Amino acid sequence: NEGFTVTAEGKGQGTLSVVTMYHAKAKDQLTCNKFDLKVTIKPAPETEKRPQDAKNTMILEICTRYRGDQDATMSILDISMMTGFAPDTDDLKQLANGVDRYISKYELDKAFSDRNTLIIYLDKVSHSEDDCLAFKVHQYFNVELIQPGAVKVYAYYNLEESCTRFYHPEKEDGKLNKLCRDELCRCAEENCFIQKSDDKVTLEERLDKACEPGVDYVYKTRLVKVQLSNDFDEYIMAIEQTIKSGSDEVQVGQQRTFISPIKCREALKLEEKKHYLMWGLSSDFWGEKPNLSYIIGKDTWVEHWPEEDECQDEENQKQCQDLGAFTESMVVFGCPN
Amino acid sequence: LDEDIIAEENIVSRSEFPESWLWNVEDLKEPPKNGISTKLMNIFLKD
Amino acid sequence: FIQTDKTIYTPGSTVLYRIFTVNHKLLPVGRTVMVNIENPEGIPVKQDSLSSQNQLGVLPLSWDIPELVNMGQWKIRAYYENSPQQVFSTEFEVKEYVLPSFEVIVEPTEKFYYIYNEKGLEVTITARFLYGKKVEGTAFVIFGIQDGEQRISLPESLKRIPIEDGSGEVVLSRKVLLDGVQNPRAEDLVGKSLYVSATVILHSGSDMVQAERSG
Amino acid sequence: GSLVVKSGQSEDRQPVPGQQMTLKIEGDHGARVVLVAVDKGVFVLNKKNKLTQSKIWDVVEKADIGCTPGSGKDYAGVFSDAGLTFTSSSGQQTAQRAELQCPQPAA
Amino acid sequence: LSVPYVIVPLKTGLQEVEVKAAVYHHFISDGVRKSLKVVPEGIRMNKTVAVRTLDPERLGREGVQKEDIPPADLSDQVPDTESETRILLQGTPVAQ
Amino acid sequence: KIVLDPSGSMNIYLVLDGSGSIGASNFTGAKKCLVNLIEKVASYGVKPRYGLVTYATYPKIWVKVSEADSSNADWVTKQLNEINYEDHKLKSGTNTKKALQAVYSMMSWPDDVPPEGWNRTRHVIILMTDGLHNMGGDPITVIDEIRDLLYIGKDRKNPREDYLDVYVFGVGPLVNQVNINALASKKDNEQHVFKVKDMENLEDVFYQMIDESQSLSLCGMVWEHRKGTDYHKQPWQAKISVIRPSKGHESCMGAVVSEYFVLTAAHCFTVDDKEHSIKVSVGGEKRDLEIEVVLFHPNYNINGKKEAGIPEFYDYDVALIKLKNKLKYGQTIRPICLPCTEGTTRALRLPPTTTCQQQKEELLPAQDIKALFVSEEEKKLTRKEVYIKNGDKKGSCERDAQYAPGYDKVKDISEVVTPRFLCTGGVSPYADPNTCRGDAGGPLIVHKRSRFIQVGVISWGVVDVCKNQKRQKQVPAHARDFHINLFQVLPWLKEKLQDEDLGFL
Numbered sequence A: 001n002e003g004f005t006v007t008a009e010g011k012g013q014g015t016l017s018v019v020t021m022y023h024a025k026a027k028d029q030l031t032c033n034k035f036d037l038k039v040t041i042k043p044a045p046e047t048e049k050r051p052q053d054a055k056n057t058m059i060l061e062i063c064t065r066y067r068g069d070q071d072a073t074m075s076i077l078d079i080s081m082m083t084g085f086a087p088d089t090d091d092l093k094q095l096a097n098g099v100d101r102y103i104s105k106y107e108l109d110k111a112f113s114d115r116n117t118l119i120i121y122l123d124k125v126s127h128s129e130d131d132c133l134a135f136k137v138h139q140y141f142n143v144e145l146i147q148p149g150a151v152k153v154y155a156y157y158n159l160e161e162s163c164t165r166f167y168h169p170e171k172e173d174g175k176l177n178k179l180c181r182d183e184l185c186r187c188a189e190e191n192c193f194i195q196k197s198d199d200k201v202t203l204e205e206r207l208d209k210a211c212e213p214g215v216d217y218v219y220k221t222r223l224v225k226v227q228l229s230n231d232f233d234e235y236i237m238a239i240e241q242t243i244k245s246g247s248d249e250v251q252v253g254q255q256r257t258f259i260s261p262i263k264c265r266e267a268l269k270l271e272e273k274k275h276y277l278m279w280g281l282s283s284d285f286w287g288e289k290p291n292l293s294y295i296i297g298k299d300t301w302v303e304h305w306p307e308e309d310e311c312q313d314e315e316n317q318k319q320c321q322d323l324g325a326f327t328e329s330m331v332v333f334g335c336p337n
Numbered sequence B: 001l002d003e004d005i006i007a008e009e010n011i012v013s014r015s016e017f018p019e020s021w022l023w024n025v026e027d028l029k030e031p032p033k034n035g036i037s038t039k040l041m042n043i044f045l046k047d
Numbered sequence C: 001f002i003q004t005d006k007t008i009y010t011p012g013s014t015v016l017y018r019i020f021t022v023n024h025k026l027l028p029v030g031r032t033v034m035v036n037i038e039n040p041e042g043i044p045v046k047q048d049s050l051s052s053q054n055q056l057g058v059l060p061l062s063w064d065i066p067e068l069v070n071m072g073q074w075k076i077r078a079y080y081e082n083s084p085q086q087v088f089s090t091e092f093e094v095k096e097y098v099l100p101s102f103e104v105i106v107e108p109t110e111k112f113y114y115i116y117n118e119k120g121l122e123v124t125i126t127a128r129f130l131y132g133k134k135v136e137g138t139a140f141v142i143f144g145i146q147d148g149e150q151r152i153s154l155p156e157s158l159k160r161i162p163i164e165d166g167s168g169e170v171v172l173s174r175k176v177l178l179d180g181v182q183n184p185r186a187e188d189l190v191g192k193s194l195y196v197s198a199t200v201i202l203h204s205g206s207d208m209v210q211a212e213r214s215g
Numbered sequence D: 001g002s003l004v005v006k007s008g009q010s011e012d013r014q015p016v017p018g019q020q021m022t023l024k025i026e027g028d029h030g031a032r033v034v035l036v037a038v039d040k041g042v043f044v045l046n047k048k049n050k051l052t053q054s055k056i057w058d059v060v061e062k063a064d065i066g067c068t069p070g071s072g073k074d075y076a077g078v079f080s081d082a083g084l085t086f087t088s089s090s091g092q093q094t095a096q097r098a099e100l101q102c103p104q105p106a107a
Numbered sequence E: 001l002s003v004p005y006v007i008v009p010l011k012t013g014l015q016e017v018e019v020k021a022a023v024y025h026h027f028i029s030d031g032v033r034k035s036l037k038v039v040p041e042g043i044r045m046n047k048t049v050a051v052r053t054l055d056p057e058r059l060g061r062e063g064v065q066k067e068d069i070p071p072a073d074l075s076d077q078v079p080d081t082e083s084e085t086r087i088l089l090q091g092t093p094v095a096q
Numbered sequence F: 001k002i003v004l005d006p007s008g009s010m011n012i013y014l015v016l017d018g019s020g021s022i023g024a025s026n027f028t029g030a031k032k033c034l035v036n037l038i039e040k041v042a043s044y045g046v047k048p049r050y051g052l053v054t055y056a057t058y059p060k061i062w063v064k065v066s067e068a069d070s071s072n073a074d075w076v077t078k079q080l081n082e083i084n085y086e087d088h089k090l091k092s093g094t095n096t097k098k099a100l101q102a103v104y105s106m107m108s109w110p111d112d113v114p115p116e117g118w119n120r121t122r123h124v125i126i127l128m129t130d131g132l133h134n135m136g137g138d139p140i141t142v143i144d145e146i147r148d149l150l151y152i153g154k155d156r157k158n159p160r161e162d163y164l165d166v167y168v169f170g171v172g173p174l175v176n177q178v179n180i181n182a183l184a185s186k187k188d189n190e191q192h193v194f195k196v197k198d199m200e201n202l203e204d205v206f207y208q209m210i211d212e213s214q215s216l217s218l219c220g221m222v223w224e225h226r227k228g229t230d231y232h233k234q235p236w237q238a239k240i241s242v243i244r245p246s247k248g249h250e251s252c253m254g255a256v257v258s259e260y261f262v263l264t265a266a267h268c269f270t271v272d273d274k275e276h277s278i279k280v281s282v283g284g285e286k287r288d289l290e291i292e293v294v295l296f297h298p299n300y301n302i303n304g305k306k307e308a309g310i311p312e313f314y315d316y317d318v319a320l321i322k323l324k325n326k327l328k329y330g331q332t333i334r335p336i337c338l339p340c341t342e343g344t345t346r347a348l349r350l351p352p353t354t355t356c357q358q359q360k361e362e363l364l365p366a367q368d369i370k371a372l373f374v375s376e377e378e379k380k381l382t383r384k385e386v387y388i389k390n391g392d393k394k395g396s397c398e399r400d401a402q403y404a405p406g407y408d409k410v411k412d413i414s415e416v417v418t419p420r421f422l423c424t425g426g427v428s429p430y431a432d433p434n435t436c437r438g439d440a441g442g443p444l445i446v447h448k449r450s451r452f453i454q455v456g457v458i459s460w461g462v463v464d465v466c467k468n469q470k471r472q473k474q475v476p477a478h479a480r481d482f483h484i485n486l487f488q489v490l491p492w493l494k495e496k497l498q499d500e501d502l503g504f505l
Ligand SMILES: *[C@@H]1O[C@H](CO)[C@@H](O[C@@H]2O[C@H](CO)[C@@H](O)[C@H](O)[C@H]2NC(C)=O)[C@H](O)[C@H]1NC(C)=O
Pocket: C040, C041, C070, C071, C072, C073, E046
């Protein structure tokens, strides 16, 4: 894109035309165009547990409405279960034979053995209010941290105009936990931290774990100030010394920004003015200089280092002892690895 | 691993997926038997 | 004569094309050829000029499609230098697509329709994967009437049939036709044409092909 | 001429992705061959503009200068309909024709 | 049998996705590594900048006509995205 | 792949990990691999600029590429041999980023002006580590700076990707593939990652990385990799068959010496054998080649002493066969080096001012000389090690020729056994195998500095333990084999091959 000068000389006549083609940001674009899709997952109440069926049971309800001027014709429902969940067979037989509703026999007679993706055909969906249906789901695989499920809707003449919803019992709406700093977004689907319980507090073992490539840097820090935001907040930490030289230089020791997701404030809130011992990996810091920010994640480890006057309690005496031995140990002897 | 399944690391992925290939040129210079040249070209398949 | 590696391309991909230059006796001739590539509305975007002498009547050329492009029909047009009014052309399409895994053929029992046939038009569906295996799925098929450039759609001729053993069957009855049209005269329908549009989706829900029989 | 493309191997089990195979090309001696291998799925998306030998002869038939399947209204019309000019010392000669196209095709 | 997955792209460009599978009790395995385009939000636009008539004899006077074309402002442009300038000229036949 | 160009200018950086994650036995295999590699590189005749650095917590520089001593293979081998695992055992860290920074500094020019030939120069980096960089920052970013310094990826017209090649050796019992795969260069169908098991079968390892671009036609260069067949190990071996009525079928061996010429014995053939009835098949091809002319030595005469009363006289048992078409050298088709040539001078790693007399003394000292010949057993080539009796037992080796049937009544032993004969065989100092009659005409091979020089041609043996396809029973103690010395007919070969461009001194 540049400006230029046109110069024409001589007898005759002509026409000048200039067109620019570029990528323009979408203005009020409707991703779920012509579709209002709502999906809700809930556990089964006490009526299900009454005959002592004794198993993991949840109810999935789906509702949708067309936005067009008239009712939309035949459409298709693509449903993906959470991993290890199979829909209740008896619920689908009841829904299948209903009017404006059909499920293929080849899909129907599959049952629990392989029914993970489900295809439901509707001859039409009303445009004035929501049309709904529901069925039970049961876990039969017994695995934790299940994959979120999804339901996609589209019509036989156009897959382009479509809509997709996700569901997960703990992620509320089944959306991904991405972290965004204005225009720059990066994923944050992790545990908040490793090892803050410490029932058996070691020192020799921790030195061996500090000598592994997964630990890129070990910092002694002091929290200066916390700055709030919407779904995150940043923690202004002062770097005191680099116990292990990491991906970045010490730079005398100045403020470096650490950020925690809103779902990690509930797990553990750091307290200001206090010192902290931390270590992580190269994937933790984010952005480009000088706007680098350290994201607290499942590879990050943090523990409070009490101040001098706080060290005098007999149990925090030994903590200030052991946290001081790790200090001198790493710098002078390094690693035999 | 000691069990009866292939380990992940030694599983090598197919990745060559071009739509069109074998954009080559060749001249029929093989010995003409009944005026018809028989050419043999060993070609690499894709994934 | 103009040859291309594919019939339809993606934005941001390379286009390879070869031009065969022959005289009126179809033997290879060595002359200078003027080549032009035009956009959907006929705007030349790229042009070439090369002689086929000592190349045995073959001119291999290439061009890259930018990401900034207007999808639609694109045409390669060529003419000899000593005959600029005699222009040859061949077309290709630009679209954002994904490769299917199976083909859909819609076969009427007769490649015509007799108006007063009581049974109606029978169209056999045939679907198979690209590697030669039978397709299992469900298809949605719709009918319409084509008169010149004017297309009329019959909404109630829509049917939903499963695809079994790599095949299906659908029949457009005479009653649906008489009900589809508002004209009780059968004489006005003679000379017009029908068209069939089929939408097939596997029972895995991971692929979909739209096929058309017309005329 | 005559150009034929077949497999170099006799038959064997269906090929493996990426595997080396032998392609056999039979054709007249001295001819230059150009190759292109495309996935059949692309043609299911778009089968238009595919060139073939029959369509080559179709353009030739559409480029013929003759307008009559033989015979004619008279002796003078025979050559002029075929696409020929005739002239003799005696005086008999072909009908004058100044148009490349054939007048109103039957279609 | 189909196994769905849910993912989120993290960086623009033609990014790569790889999956592997191996069967039990037979040493038969397969892996698929494919790439798809990660496109920033938006869509292609073909807007017109300016159209003017050229006539050096009548316009501009004394056989010369010159005028500038300012660059497009495009305030809705997606950051760090391509932008092409399409220039076309066509003469007017002045022979009756 | 690494290119071998004699006109080249190439820097080779050797980085060896020394952390406690390796182990002593693994560290030794790392050195033994480098010693064989450097030796094989110098055997090809390319002299690169070697840089030798060992690192753990802190890198330790042994050889700098700026030094002229860096081009000395034996001197660098001495520096490498001196390196000990326990040199800095107490600092057994893994700080790979600093080690790459030292290499980056070596190729770095002072100020902003690179010396001429910077892009003309090839750069090769060889790294051995456990893939566990635990101290310091990311090491991969320094690789980009090395890619940066070498102007790689900076031009569409000139990529310069082949001016830098990165090989990584996975050493130690525990190893990380992920970091290793990132460090190594990525090129189409080229291996740059090697594991611990690769320390065995070293020749195959080098076969993947070595590119013989400018050394295809060099003499006496052999591929010893395990997958290689008979002719990968013997490129010069030539099989000659003559089938003619009355004479019948007969086969002898030959050795490639030039583009058109193959060297073999004379008593196998005769002038009456016609050129169309003689078929030659060179190693690596089963197609029988047509010949043009056969050059028997002028002083050859099988019946030289037939009228005197001696049945057969094998003096000057050499012949040159000229092929109708010229050979194209390859990995299985290469000549064997000849004494007093520029190729033999470079093969022995001697200065170009070395004389023909000095090379004769080195090849033939006044002692028992180790040697070997090639023989066929069920159509497969195999090597048999023998001793050339040039020492104190040289007289006993010549005397044992009288026990061959047909020469019992010769009074003077020095009369029949001419100075052309080289004498092998016997049981002292050790048992030397005896040749088959089909093995005649083959070369007599001596190994020096990872190369092979021809010193003789197989003539005849005293006792024919290999009478016909069977070599049964152990050999007599006086069973000797005789070979024609090359120095006696060297002037004639120099006369014939003066236009063949072999660089005779
Ligand atoms: C310019 O933008 C239009 C946006 O629709 C592109 O598509 C054309 O849209 C009009 C609707 O106003 C249709 O009538 C045309 O048929 C569409 N084009 C084609 C090729 O079908 C259009 O392609 C863009 N580019 C140009 C050069 O017009």
